[PDB]
Amino acid sequence: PVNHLVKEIDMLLKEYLLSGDISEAEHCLKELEVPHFHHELVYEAIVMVLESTGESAFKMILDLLKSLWKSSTITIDQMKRGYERIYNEIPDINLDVPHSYSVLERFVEECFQAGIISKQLRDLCP
């Protein structure tokens, strides 16, 4: 069966892509009280980006992760783990979604330019 937190994080991310309401997404994540599982949010969100068409999800998810990083809602370790998961799976993801390496690189670079990931995590992108 699917982990119920995975389900709540997927719902949260979908409601945010539908509404654009960053504040509601932050509040809904906080209500879960699972700061130990915030890597799942980072991972699920970047997968949505990679699977989307056009530029809109990329931008919405960049804005979400920027906001959640600045409000201290996602911490460094959680950001690190989530990105590491993507880095591990990008070979499999790219098998199904051509040009994902290229989208991931642009996403990683924009997160770096926004100041929300370290140069180290930046450079760790395979």
Curated annotation (Swiss-Prot):
Phenotypic consequence of residue 92 to A: Strongly reduced interaction with EIF4A1
Localization, UniProt: Nucleus; Cytoplasm
Tissue and organ expression note: Expressed ubiquitously. Highyly expressed in thymus and liver. Moderately expressed in brain, kidney and spleen; weakly in lung and heart. Expression is up- or down-regulated in response to apoptosis inducers. Regulated by many programmed cell death-inducing stimuli.
Disulfide bonds: none
Domain of life: Eukaryota
Occurrences of domain MI (ranges): 4-126
PTM field: Polyubiquitinated, leading to its proteasomal degradation. Rapidly degraded in response to mitogens. Phosphorylation of the phosphodegron promotes interaction with BTRC and proteasomal degradation.
Primary role: Inhibits translation initiation and cap-dependent translation. May excert its function by hindering the interaction between EIF4A1 and EIF4G. Inhibits the helicase activity of EIF4A. Modulates the activation of JUN kinase. Down-regulates the expression of MAP4K1, thus inhibiting events important in driving invasion, namely, MAPK85 activation and consequent JUN-dependent transcription. May play a role in apoptosis. Tumor suppressor. Inhibits tumor promoter-induced neoplastic transformation. Binds RNA.
Family affiliation: Belongs to the PDCD4 family.
Involvement in disease: Decreases benign tumor development and malignant progression.
Subunit comment: Interacts (via MI domains) with EIF4A1 and EIF4A2 (via N-terminal domain). Heterotrimer with EIF4A1; one molecule of PDCD4 binds two molecules of EIF4A1. Interacts with EIF4G1. May form a complex with EIF4A1 and EIF4G1. The interaction between PDCD4 and EIF4A1 interferes with the interaction between EIF4A1 and EIF4G. When phosphorylated, interacts with BTRC and FBXW11.
Recorded domain comment: Binds EIF4A1 via both MI domains.
This protein's name: Programmed cell death protein 4
Natural source organism: Mus musculus (Mouse)
